[PDB]
Design a protein around this ligand. Structure first.
Ligand code: CA
Length: 449
C-alpha cells in the first residue's frame, strides 16, 4: 500500500547521491527522498539566509548582476563531476526577458553551501555597451538562444555536454570539458537542435538509455501557467548532439514556429487531463494541468526509468507540486509514461483476465492546449476486439501492447506497455496501459475494476 508525500519543487533536476535522490529546482527549492514517494523539503526559496547558497545575492553577484534580479535562480541542476565535487548549473533571468546567464556554483557537499565557480553563457548583450553575442555577432533574440535551463549530461563515452534554452533562438548544445565543466572554446552558442524564432519550448533534458543505445531529448512545449498548455515532448538520436528525430522521422532541427506548428513535432508524453466522469474540476479525481519541465533518471540497480516534473492541478490554479512517474520503453524504443505516480510497480507479463475489460481511455493528442481532457470508455475484449468509444484491435507480447484503433479514414497503431499500477485517487491496484503512435500521440488506459 503506497503512501506519498510530495514536495514543492518547480523545474526539478534529479541527482542521486548515495542512497538518496535529490531534486533541485527554481527558487532554490530542494527536497530528497529515499523511496521516490515520500519527499522531505530541504529548501523553499533563495532568501538571503537559505543554506544552499547563503547570501546568494553576494555569492552569485556576477549572474544576478547580468540578469538584474535578486533572491532567485531558476532551473538549477547539480551534477557530480570527475573531481568528486557537486556542480550546480543554474540560470538567472527576468520573466520573458532574453537577458540571462547560465552560471555554475560548486560544493563538496550535496546540500551545500555552494559557491561561485563560473559564468559560462550570456544573452541579451546590448552591443553599444556589452558588445556582441557569444558567437561574435550582435545578439538578436530570434536566432540566438536565451541563456536558460541548462541540461548537463555525460555521453556513453564520458564526454560532457550542456543542452539549454527557452523560447527565443531555440535549444542549443555545447560540448563541455569534463575536467572543468566549462564550454570548450569557439563553439559560441553551440549547435541548434530545436526551435528558433520565438518557438514556445524550454526545459531541455537529455537522458541516455543503455537499453536502446539512443539519447532522448525531452522538452516542454507551451506556457507553464494554469492556462499555458505545458506539455512534455520527446525526441531521440544516436548522437548526444543530434540531430534529434521524433517517432514519425521528422527532424527536430525543423521544429520552429507558432504553437500550432511546433505541436506537429515530437512525441507528446502527457498534457492536461482529469480522471473524472462528472467534470473538468473534481478534487477527488486524479488530474494534472500543465505538467512539465522534467528531468529523468535511469536506475541501473533495478533497470527502471523515472521522470521528474512539476504540475498544477485542475481547478487549483498556480499551485504546483513535484511528481514522479515511471517511464517504460515500448517495442520501438520510445518512452511511454505510467499513468499514475510511481508506486514500487515493476512491469511483468499479465494474464488475459487482468487485461480484458472496460477502460477509461485518455488520448492526449498532439496540441498545445489548456483543455483538460477527460476519458472515454473502451473495452478490451477477449477476442482481440476493441469496442465502445473507439473501434479496433489490441494484442500483446509480454508486457508490450499494440492497439490498432480506427480513427476516421485510417488505422492508427499505438505501441506501449501494460502493467499493474497503483490507482492514486482510488487507492487500489489496477491494470493500465500507456502507448504511443508514430504520429507522436500518447494514449493511457486505466481499467475500471
Ligand atoms: Ca535547467
Amino acid at each position: 500500500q503506497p503512501t506519498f508525500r510530495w514536495a514543492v519543487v518547480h523545474d526539478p533536476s534529479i541527482i542521486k547521491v548515495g542512497n538518496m535522490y535529490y531534486v533541485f529546482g527554481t527558487h532554490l527549492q530542494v527536497a530528497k527522498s529515499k523511496d521516490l514517494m515520500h519527499w522531505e523539503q530541504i529548501n523553499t526559496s533563495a532568501h538571503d539566509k537559505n543554506p544552499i547558497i547563503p547570501n546568494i545575492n553576494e555569492e552569485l553577484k556576477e549572474t544576478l548582476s547580468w540578469a538584474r534580479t535578486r533572491n532567485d535562480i531558476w532551473a538549477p541542476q547539480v551534477i557530480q563531476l570527475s573531481d568528486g565535487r557537486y556542480y550546480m548549473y543554474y540560470c538567472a533571468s527576468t520573466f520573458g526577458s532574453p537577458r540571462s546567464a547560465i552560471g555554475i556554483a560548486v560544493s563538496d557537499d550535496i546540500e551545500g553551501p555552494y559557491k561561485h565557480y563560473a559564468v559560462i553563457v550570456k544573452s541579451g548583450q546590448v552591443y553599444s555597451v556589452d558588445g556582441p553575442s557569444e558567437d561574435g555577432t550582435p545578439y538578436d533574440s530570434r536566432k540566438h538562444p536565451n541563456a536558460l535551463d541548462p541540461g548537463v549530461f555525460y555521453d556513453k563515452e564520458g564526454n560532457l555536454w550542456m543542452v539549454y534554452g527557452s523560447w527565443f533562438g531555440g535549444i542549443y548544445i555545447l560540448k563541455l570539458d569534463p575536467n572543468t565543466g566549462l564550454p570548450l572554446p569557439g563553439q559560441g552558442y553551440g549547435k541548434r537542435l530545436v526551435g528558433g524564432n520565438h518557438s514556445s519550448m524550454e526545459g531541455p533534458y537529455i537522458l541516455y538509455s543503455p537499453d536502446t543505445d539512443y539519447y532522448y531529448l525531452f522538452l516542454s512545449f507551451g506556457g507553464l501557467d494554469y492556462r499555458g498548455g505545458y506539455n512534455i515532448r520527446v525526441a531521440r538520436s544516436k548522437n548526444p548532439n543530434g540531430p534529434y528525430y521524433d517517432p514519425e522521422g521528422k527532424s527536430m532541427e525543423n521544429c520552429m514556429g507558432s504553437k500550432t506548428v511546433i505541436s506537429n513535432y515530437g512525441a507528446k508524453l502527457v498534457g492536461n487531463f482529469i480522471l473524472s466522469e462528472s467534470n473538468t474540476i473534481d478534487f477527488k479525481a486524479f488530474g494534472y494541468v500543465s505538467p512539465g519541465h522534467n528531468s529523468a533518471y535511469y536506475d541501473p540497480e533495478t533497470g527502471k526509468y523515472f521522470i521528474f516534473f512539476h504540475t498544477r492541478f485542475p481547478g487549483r490554479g498556480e499551485t504546483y507540486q513535484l511528481r514522479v512517474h515511471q517511464l517504460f520503453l515500448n517495442e520501438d524504443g520510445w518512452f511511454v509514461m505510467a499513468p499514475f505516480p510511481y508506486g514500487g510497480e515493476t512491469v511483468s507479463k499479465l494474464p488475459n483476465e487482468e487485461i480484458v475489460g472496460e477502460y477509461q481511455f485518455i488520448n492526449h493528442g498532439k496540441e498545445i492546449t489548456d483543455k483538460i481532457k477527460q476519458p472515454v470508455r473502451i473495452k478490451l475484449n477477449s477476442d482481440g476486439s476493441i469496442t465502445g468509444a473507439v473501434e479496433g484491435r489490441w494484442e500483446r507480447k509480454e508486457h508490450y501492447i499494440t492497439l490498432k484503433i480506427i480513427e476516421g479514414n485510417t488505422t492508427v497503431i499505438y505501441k506501449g506497455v501494460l502493467l499493474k499500477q497503483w490507482h492514486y485517487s482510488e487507492k487500489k491496484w489496477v491494470t493500465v496501459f500507456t502507448a504511443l503512435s508514430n504520429q507522436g500521440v500518447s494514449v493511457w488506459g486505466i481499467r475500471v475494476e
